[PDB]
């Protein structure tokens, strides 16, 4: 449990410090894949 | 993308519904202007 | 041909982006091959 605690608080501090992001050029893609989904299926959102 | 999606979701409506416009138009026609029996009887 | 059309991601073709392994020891046994694969088997 004190590795495990310690290697997800050198990752995290990592992601702030350095830059281990989610492909921001391939990341457009991912959120337009899912607005042409959803506009496809035409699948109304959650209301309030 | 958030403002290009908004726009581009917009527009696709806009489409729909000028497809949903010109369906309902066309069914609207061909129920009223009926071939055989429209008001005669 | 013609079989991934709707494929997003076409081709990663790296897997560490570095090297194909660590292929390096270090001092350090938390940050090693080791405390590495001991976090990630019994560990989930």
Same mark, same amino acid.
């Given at each position: 449990?004190?590795?495990?605690?310690?290697?997800?608080?050198?990752?995290?501090?990592?992601?702030?410090?350095?830059?281990?992001?989610?492909?921001?050029?391939? =990341?457009?893609?991912?959120?337009?894949?899912?607005?042409?989904?959803?506009?496809?299926?035409?699948?109304?959102? &959650?209301?309030? | =993308?958030?403002?290009?999606?908004?726009? =581009?979701?917009?527009?696709?409506?806009?489409? #729909?519904?000028?497809?949903?416009?010109?369906?309902?138009?066309?069914?609207?026609?061909?129920?009223? #202007?009926?071939?055989?029996?429209?008001?005669?009887? | 041909?013609?079989?991934?059309?709707?494929?997003?991601?076409?081709?990663?073709?790296?897997?560490?982006?570095?090297?194909?392994?660590?292929?390096?020891?270090?001092?350090?046994?938390?940050?090693?091959?080791?405390?590495?694969?001991?976090?990630?088997?019994? &560990?989930?």
């Amino acid at each position: 449990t004190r590795l495990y605690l310690k290697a997800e608080q050198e990752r995290q501090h990592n992601y702030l410090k350095d830059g281990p992001y989610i492909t921001a050029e391939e =990341a457009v893609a991912v959120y337009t894949t899912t607005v042409h989904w959803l506009e496809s299926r035409r699948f109304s959102p &959650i209301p309030f | =993308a958030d403002r290009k999606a908004r726009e =581009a979701v917009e527009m696709r409506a806009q489409v #729909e519904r000028k497809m949903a416009q010109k369906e309902k138009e066309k069914h609207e026609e061909k129920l009223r #202007e009926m071939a055989q029996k429209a008001r005669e009887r | 041909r013609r079989w991934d059309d709707d494929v997003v991601f076409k081709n990663c073709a790296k897997g560490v982006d570095d090297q194909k392994k660590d292929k390096r020891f270090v001092n350090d046994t938390l940050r090693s091959e080791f405390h590495k694969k001991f976090m990630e088997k019994y &560990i989930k």
